Assembly symmetry: C2
Homo-oligomer: 70 residues x 2
């Protein structure tokens, strides 16, 4: 038979930028992430170097940490 | 004024397959997802045909639903 499966992926990503405060750093990252919300397809660069594409049904995000660099 | 941000992305993806049972379907999906865990990058396709690439630090997954197709 055929089956459809919906899978929840919880990812953590790292994004660096330049800004005069962590608040502005967060606004910059937020704009980027907000523009991803309706993406239809996500791809992973796997450990062996192959790329796999998947249908993306939903996305949510939240910033976890913002840290000044030396 | 450089900043690092760690961002949590919560994605829902779809996988379809063929199997004799939902149990086997979930085993198949689990093998696919296990092979994503050590990915180095995740990428999103935008509606305007641009791709945004992000460095992955962590991943976890869980199957949400498994449904027989007609």
């Amino acid at each position: 038979a055929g089956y459809l499966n919906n899978i929840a992926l919880n990812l953590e990503i790292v994004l660096k930028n330049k800004a005069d405060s962590p608040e502005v750093s967060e606004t910059l990252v937020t704009r980027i992430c907000e523009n991803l919300l309706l993406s239809k397809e996500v791809s992973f660069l796997k450990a062996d170097g192959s790329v796999e594409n998947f249908k993306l049904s939903d996305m949510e995000y939240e910033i976890t940490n913002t840290e000044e660099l030396p």
